[PDB]
Amino acid sequence: VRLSGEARKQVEVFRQNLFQEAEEFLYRFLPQKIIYLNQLLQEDSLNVADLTSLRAPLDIPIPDPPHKCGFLPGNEKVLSLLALVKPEVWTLKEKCILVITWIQHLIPKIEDGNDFGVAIQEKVLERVNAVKTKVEAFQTTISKYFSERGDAVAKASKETHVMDYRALVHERDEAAYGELRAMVLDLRAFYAELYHIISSNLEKIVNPKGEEKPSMY
Amino acid sequence: SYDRAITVFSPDGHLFQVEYAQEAVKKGSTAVGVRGRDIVVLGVEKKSVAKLQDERTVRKICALDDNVCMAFAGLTADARIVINRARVECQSHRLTVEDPVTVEYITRYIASLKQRYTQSNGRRPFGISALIVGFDFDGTPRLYQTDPSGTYHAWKANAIGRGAKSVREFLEKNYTDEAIETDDLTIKLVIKALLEVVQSGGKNIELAVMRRDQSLKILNPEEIEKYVAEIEKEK
Amino acid sequence: RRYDSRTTIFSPEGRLYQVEYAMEAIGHAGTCLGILANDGVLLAAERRNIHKLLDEVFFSEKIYKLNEDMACSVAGITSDANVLTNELRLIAQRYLLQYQEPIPCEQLVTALCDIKQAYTQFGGKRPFGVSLLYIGWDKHYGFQLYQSDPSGNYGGWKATCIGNNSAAAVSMLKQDYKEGEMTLKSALALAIKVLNKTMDVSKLSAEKVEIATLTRENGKTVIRVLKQKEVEQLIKKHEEEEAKAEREK
Amino acid sequence: FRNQYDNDVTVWSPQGRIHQIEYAMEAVKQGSATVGLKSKTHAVLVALKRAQSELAAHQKKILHVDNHIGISIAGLTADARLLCNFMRQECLDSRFVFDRPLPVSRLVSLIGSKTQIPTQRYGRRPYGVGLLIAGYDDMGPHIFQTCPSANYFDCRAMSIGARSQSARTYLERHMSEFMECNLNELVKHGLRALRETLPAEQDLTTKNVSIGIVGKDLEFTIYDDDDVSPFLEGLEERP
Amino acid sequence: MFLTRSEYDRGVNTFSPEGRLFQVEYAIEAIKLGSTAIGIQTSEGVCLAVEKRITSPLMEPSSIEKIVEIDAHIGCAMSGLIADAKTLIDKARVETQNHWFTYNETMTVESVTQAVSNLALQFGEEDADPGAMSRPFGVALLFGGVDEKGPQLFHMDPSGTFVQCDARAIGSASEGAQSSLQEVYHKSMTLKEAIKSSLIILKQVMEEKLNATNIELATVQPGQNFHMFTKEELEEVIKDI
Amino acid sequence: AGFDRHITIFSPEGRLYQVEYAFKAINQGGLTSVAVRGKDCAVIVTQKKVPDKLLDSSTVTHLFKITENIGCVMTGMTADSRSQVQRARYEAANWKYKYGYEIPVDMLCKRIADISQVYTQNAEMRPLGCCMILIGIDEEQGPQVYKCDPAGYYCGFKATAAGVKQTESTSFLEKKVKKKFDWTFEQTVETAITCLSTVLSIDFKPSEIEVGVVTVENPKFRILTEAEIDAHLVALAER
Amino acid sequence: TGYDLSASTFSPDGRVFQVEYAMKAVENSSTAIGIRCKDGVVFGVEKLVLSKLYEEGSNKRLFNVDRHVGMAVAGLLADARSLADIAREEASNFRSNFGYNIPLKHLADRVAMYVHAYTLYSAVRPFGCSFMLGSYSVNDGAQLYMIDPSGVSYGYWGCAIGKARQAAKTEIEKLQMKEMTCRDIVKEVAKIIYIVHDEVKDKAFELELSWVGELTNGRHEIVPKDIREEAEKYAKESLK
Amino acid sequence: RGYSFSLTTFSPSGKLVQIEYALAAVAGGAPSVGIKAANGVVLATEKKQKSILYDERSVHKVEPITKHIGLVYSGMGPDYRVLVHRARKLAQQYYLVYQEPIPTAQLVQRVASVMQEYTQSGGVRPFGVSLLICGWNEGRPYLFQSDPSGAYFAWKATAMGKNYVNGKTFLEKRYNEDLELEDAIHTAILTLKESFEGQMTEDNIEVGICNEAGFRRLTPTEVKDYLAA
């Protein structure tokens, strides 16, 4: 199609920015994030052993057998750990988007054969899309935690006589802590798996069809 | 889909198994050829000694006849078969027409053999490309290249095998009438070109020359050491 | 999807996977070893068949004599091995009939390797799932050791091993082998050492190995198989030496 | 699905139909149309030629096998050329051996056998070409058609190729008068018949028409672009 | 809505539904990969031209031979697979010399084209000989020669069909080059005009700027034999344009 | 799976399922044949079923004469049966030509069976879906009964059956040999007929069965007439 | 199920289905019948006229495979013509070697074995033709044989092949051919063919008849047109 | 996968799996036992018959190739006979060429070469049978096995067929090199007695012996006498 010089410049600018950003990300940002998440899971807060340390008071007046509930705070430990985790999961989703776009722009013209390189590109795309779905699952469950805990404490205050709702609130907090530590572990693992697969197959990823043939034609 | 048989054409008319054989050639060790005014130099990299192996058994450069030699990049056994077949054809041509083979004649024969193996299924293409060098009756230097497909082309200078793209870019830059002026300059040019893609200089290159009316000479390792030393010093 | 069938299709990236799968087969085989020395060349192999009710009727299970001036040891499929050895003997005797001189070692290896390449290239037949070592003396180049593979590619080696734990054998031989300093006795000791290292059995039985040596005596090559007493003495000497090296520490 | 049973000629279908032979019979439909018709004293072949481009010459659709036999092809030119070579050699062999012109019926029988052998065996494809064979012999004028299936027919008139049903119906409604026609009347009838097959925009020309005539006194002759103008001029116009 | 099953294209000797025999059609598609070649037939002669498509400067330009001599009277220009082209050129040459041997005369361009076409037809494998390539010949040839009928230009394709053509273009830009041929060509044009027009069209289609190196040009005239324009003659004409 | 559908390939249990399917092909016919040996005679009986009245009853037969003194009964595909019969006749005549004496029944069975082996080992052809049972008199060994099967097994027998009711028939015959007293010619024929009639439940009439016999007194194989068959049948019913 | 693809294969239940699929080929064909009587054998074919353009006396399904025998075919006409060439070759070879006209039973056996060769091998398909053979010789008598695509061969007092086989067979069954003579049998063959012909599905047919017998001095020949017209008029009259 | 069906295709990990399947076909075959005594070698196998109707004299599982060689099989009966005919023919060719009885080692080499010849071509299947080839040459006994693969081995004693592993263990427990054949036949029938799943009788087994005299199939009366113990 006819392209203006400005149009060609804009497209080439996007292309070069994407290529250089992908190189910078995989070579520099990924190792940094791997060690950062590693030390973070090594942090003592993520390695809490006695879960009753995590459970926080719910000041619901227990009903005496025959007045009102004060402000019920969120679990400070869990919300602080969430404040740590949320930047990481959103960052990983952003970087996986970047990798997807980089590989897709590297996909060559459709052709009948020599499709092994594009097959490699498709396989690594399958993997990066898989981790993308996984991080989206992380992103929805973090909101599910807040909604579920709020509903639970509302139920406990409404029906004081039921203690199972109180046990449920504590259980939601504990399950949330377990999910969060598994989450940071998975985030580090996803960064590392991206690095490994891309570094291993970079030659076919960047140059799928390969070097020019002797041209029998 | 269309890459499993040599006979079948693809949509858009690509025969892909021959392309795969041409790709197989790229795996092989590098080889380089250059035409000097009075010399043709053929240089090939050496993979590694392995310290319990005898170097004499492995030789990429070979003499088809008194006036023709080849180097190959690709499947070693296939190269051995093709070399033997070309040698017997050389002696048979001398038998038939009482004259020595021309370089274009022998490269045509080798290309025809490779073509014969491509055309029919039940046979796989020879996974080799070759660099054939010789001096014709007039005495002009000749350099030809062949590939699994069966096309042959004369080259002023060329490379085959792994790193062929890089070294041929270097050679497109470096090659000129000035460099071909001296035989030592031709040898130094090919040595520098192989140095462009090789782990170490003297140990990992096996080089040979053909002069106007002399047999093939594989340069001694001491001579190659002297030439790389001269090349190294000038930088 | 599948570019590994029919041995005549170059896969993308240009690899013949049938021959590679055949090369995989030799790794399962019993380890065979060959060492080159100044005065002679030897072949040593591990008799993988160690069933109690087997008879040692033959000259050797693994070692074969191809000619007056050379021998071979085989690792791979025994049937293809038998075929290849028969072809080798016929080739050598054809050369002797034509030129009335013994077949050169490299020429015989090259001929059989041409056969093995041919089986790769044409469609119907499978590649020979065999790798075998050749040892011989020729007037042109003296004592020589050669290795071949299913691909039809051969090389000359001072010392090499094929079969199971070949990498360990080669690693041990690399450090131990002294270029230009070996004698047949020292090479035999080295062979016992590397075989003991590679073979899973703690003690080399002296019925679980077969050793043969090629030497030139009185202007005529002699290919001899060391008898059970000789190899028993060798393993006893190696055990004593290794224990004394142990005792010092 | 039934993609199976279509791969090769050697596979019968569950309802007793060899689909590759039928797929070969589709090949004749691809080619430009041809018409053949006979009188008591003559047999005629007329064809519509096609051109790859304006600069290119029109293809050869009528071929002479012998003085007493000639053919016109619809379908693959390769198979046409091969079968024509076989027929020519058969006629030459008959003249060498017996010093008589080969009977046209016997020649089409030979064509049928040669064509049948591919259909039954694995390997060579069915000959995907349909031929109209026209000749004069002692018995009289004859017209035959051969399908990519080795079956052959004897015809008062016939048309093969693309859009040939129109020519067939014209021929059928006008057939009775053909037998007593002059050669000029007969070639004019055949020309109108192939004119039925053409697109409405297209019309008969000197270029795209070829005419082949054989008779008691006339050996097989192909009247080319310049020579068809006497026969074409009589025709009036499109209806 | 996409139906891409094909499932019949693979393997010659298979008539697909509608009886199209797609391997041959794919072979006819194959010549579009080749360099563009162009032929013009005139009363003064027939000219042939082709773009060499030099990959690298080091490659010798003379070695690329996309126009060749079958005999003095006939020359050929080819686009498509160089190897099977060489095979068909060999068949053409041996058939011309066999005709000279047997009948002491020169073949017509139509007869030579038919001779090579018969070889091209053998992909069908009707013959039992082993030495015939199963695949169709992936090349198109342009046969130009002066015969008893004067200058003649014949086109040959992978199918083995052949036709005379006043002007034809084969190769990648045959589509569009043929339209340019159709507009420019008139039967009366002299060979000088034909050479200039063919080189104009080749300049249009060729990606690289036209130069004496990257084209090959030839002409066979009634008085002359097959002739290739040298570097100097090519320089003169490409300057004249 | 795919381990079936080709005779060459072995199953992972090494069974060659295709030949086992050829064994089923015998039972697909719906007919049974029985052979029983005697002290001085051997007999073969088999069902004769005429699907249509229009069929000539004389032409339809499963009893064939390989040579003057050997007879066979084929069970399975009619065409494969006739082909194997022709091959057996050729083998017998060729044996006589080469070696100067009539082929033994065992050697004929061995030749036919090893041919069946070459069929079950080579790829392209299929095992003939038929079973043969040969009866003859050997001077040294007396009467003989032998059976070929599609696999190449050729074992000799005292008595046997083939077809759909083979298991029932051999169960019946096994009891009769176990209570061995003897078999004269009449008792041999009666045992065969009773076995076939009992397993089928047919209660035959003379047209429904065809019997062939060999005897040391008259070595030539003969196919008994309907009258002789009815004579034997009436004797069975009377007692 | 890949069992039906090839004739080398067997079904798991012991059936070679390609042969049955080929047997289904003949049922596509228009009917043909042959009746044997004391004097000789009469053949008849319902040759459907596909187009007015086609010449009469074309697409003949009645062939003469030797002077004393004739062949009537149903199924693929190409395969049938080829089988007729094979039968003619067999008859000529028999005459050349053994010095006399081939017996019909032997000829049927040889062509049947040739047919049966094809069911075995994978490379080549079964024939798509079922055909009847008939001859009269003073020694052998009147003989009618039918060969299926399998290579099964049998002798029939009356026989039918093609689309309307079953109806034709019952009509033939109620005939008593053994006592009758050929000049009546031609009329009854015409009657049966006209009965089984379906006017709605099949537009029109031209009755094609032949016989062999003593009346020919043992030569198979096409019916004289007067006798054809008489039989056809009788068939139209009886049809009502 | 595709490796399973093809015979000229090395599977990944380098296995010719169709041959392994042929060996599985051998394993299903009836038990056969071979014991090499000092003065002889005994070959034994079960000849279990489906019914009394079978005539035992008609066919034999133990066959002589030559005067001094005989063999027994476990696997496919037809394949056994193809190669027994070929073995007899090879031995006679040797006698024509050299005018000496063929050595047992040479015969097993040749028949194994035949068996290997069959495996290479795709159009054919391997022989679904293995053999125990026994002989007496140069005043020495011999026992050999030849598998479908085309390989051969020399066994002092071994078993093939059903329960061959258990039979081999029983043999190595019971085997002594000093055994005379009078004892070795007893050991062989015991080795088979492990694996019949029926009451063995003179008919149900077939056994043969080789010695300085040559190979012979000892009669039903002889095997009855030996079975009496």
UniProtKB/Swiss-Prot annotation, chain B:
PROSITE patterns per UniProt: PROTEASOME_ALPHA_1, PROTEASOME_ALPHA_2
Post-translation changes: Phosphorylation by ABL1 or ABL2 leads to an inhibition of proteasomal activity and cell cycle transition blocks.
One GO MF term attached to the UniProt entry: identical protein binding
Modification N6-acetyllysine, positions: 226
Glycan-modified residues: 129
Induction: Down-regulated by the ribozyme Rz3'X. Up-regulated in colorectal cancer tissues.
GO biological process: proteasome-mediated ubiquitin-dependent protein catabolic process
SUPFAM superfamilies listed in its UniProt record: N-terminal nucleophile aminohydrolases (Ntn hydrolases) (SSF56235)
Keyword Cytoplasm: yes
GO CC annotations on file: cytoplasm; cytosol; extracellular exosome; nucleoplasm; nucleus; proteasome complex; proteasome core complex; proteasome core complex, alpha-subunit complex
Keywords: Acetylation, Cytoplasm, Glycoprotein, Host-virus interaction, Nucleus, Phosphoprotein, Proteasome
Modified residues (Phosphotyrosine): 152
Localization annotation: Cytoplasm; Nucleus
Family to which this protein belongs: Belongs to the peptidase T1A family.
Annotated NCBIfam families: PRK03996.1
Function: Component of the 20S core proteasome complex involved in the proteolytic degradation of most intracellular proteins. This complex plays numerous essential roles within the cell by associating with different regulatory particles. Associated with two 19S regulatory particles, forms the 26S proteasome and thus participates in the ATP-dependent degradation of ubiquitinated proteins.
Protein name (record): Proteasome subunit alpha type-7
Annotated source species: Homo sapiens
Organismal lineage: Eukaryota, Metazoa, Chordata, Craniata, Vertebrata
Gene expressing this chain: PSMA7
Curated annotation (Swiss-Prot), chain C:
Subcellular location: Cytoplasm; Nucleus
Induction of synthesis: Down-regulated by antioxidants BO-653 and probucol.
Pfam families xref list: Proteasome, Proteasome_A_N
This protein's record includes keyword Acyltransferase: no
Signal peptide (from-to): none
Residue positions where Phosphoserine is found in the record: 11, 73, 171
GO CC, one annotated term: intracellular membrane-bounded organelle
Alphabetical keyword list: Acetylation, Cytoplasm, Host-virus interaction, Nucleus, Phosphoprotein, Proteasome
Modified residues (N6-acetyllysine): 125, 174
Gene Ontology biological-process annotations: proteasome-mediated ubiquitin-dependent protein catabolic process
Assembly, per entry: The 26S proteasome consists of a 20S proteasome core and two 19S regulatory subunits. The 20S proteasome core is a barrel-shaped complex made of 28 subunits that are arranged in four stacked rings. The two outer rings are each formed by seven alpha subunits, and the two inner rings are formed by seven beta subunits. The proteolytic activity is exerted by three beta-subunits PSMB5, PSMB6 and PSMB7. (Microbial infection) Interaction with HTLV-1 TAX protein favors NFKB1 activation.
Family statement drawn from the similarity comment of this UniProt entry: Belongs to the peptidase T1A family.
Role: Component of the 20S core proteasome complex involved in the proteolytic degradation of most intracellular proteins. This complex plays numerous essential roles within the cell by associating with different regulatory particles. Associated with two 19S regulatory particles, forms the 26S proteasome and thus participates in the ATP-dependent degradation of ubiquitinated proteins.
The protein's name: Proteasome subunit alpha type-4
From Swiss-Prot, chain D:
Highest taxon in the source lineage: Eukaryota
Cross-link Glycyl lysine isopeptide (Lys-Gly) (interchain with G-Cter in ubiquitin), sequence positions: 114, 207
Residue positions where Phosphoserine is found in the record: 109, 176
UniProt subcellular location: Cytoplasm; Nucleus
Subunit field text: The 26S proteasome consists of a 20S proteasome core and two 19S regulatory subunits. The 20S proteasome core is a barrel-shaped complex made of 28 subunits that are arranged in four stacked rings. The two outer rings are each formed by seven alpha subunits, and the two inner rings are formed by seven beta subunits. The proteolytic activity is exerted by three beta-subunits PSMB5, PSMB6 and PSMB7. Interacts with NOTCH3. Interacts with ZFAND1.
Recorded GO CC terms: centrosome; cytoplasm; cytosol; extracellular exosome; nucleoplasm; nucleus; proteasome complex; proteasome core complex
Record keywords, A-Z: Acetylation, Cytoplasm, Glycoprotein, Immunity, Isopeptide bond, Nucleus, Phosphoprotein, Proteasome, Ubl conjugation
PANTHER family for this protein: PROTEASOME SUBUNIT ALPHA/BETA
Function, in words: Component of the 20S core proteasome complex involved in the proteolytic degradation of most intracellular proteins. This complex plays numerous essential roles within the cell by associating with different regulatory particles. Associated with two 19S regulatory particles, forms the 26S proteasome and thus participates in the ATP-dependent degradation of ubiquitinated proteins.
Family, similarity comment: Belongs to the peptidase T1A family.
Primary residence: cytoplasm
Carbohydrate-modified residues: 109
GO molecular function: lipopolysaccharide binding
Protein name: Proteasome subunit alpha type-1
From Swiss-Prot, chain G:
Record protein name field: Proteasome subunit alpha type-3
Function: Component of the 20S core proteasome complex involved in the proteolytic degradation of most intracellular proteins. This complex plays numerous essential roles within the cell by associating with different regulatory particles. Associated with two 19S regulatory particles, forms the 26S proteasome and thus participates in the ATP-dependent degradation of ubiquitinated proteins.
Sequence positions bearing N6-acetyllysine: 52, 201, 225
Organism: Homo sapiens
Highest taxon of the lineage: Eukaryota
Database matches in InterPro entries: Ntn_hydrolases_N, Proteasome_alpha, Proteasome_alpha-type, Proteasome_asu_N, Proteasome_sua/b
Gene: PSMA3
Modified residues (Phosphoserine): 238
Family of this protein: Belongs to the peptidase T1A family.
Main location group: cytoplasm
SMART domains per the UniProt record, alphabetical: Proteasome_A_N
MF terms in GO: ubiquitin protein ligase binding
This protein's UniProt keywords: Acetylation, Cytoplasm, Host-virus interaction, Nucleus, Phosphoprotein, Proteasome
GO biological process: one example: proteasome-mediated ubiquitin-dependent protein catabolic process
Gene Ontology cellular component terms for the protein in this record: cytoplasm; cytosol; extracellular exosome; nucleoplasm; nucleus; proteasome complex; proteasome core complex; proteasome core complex, alpha-subunit complex
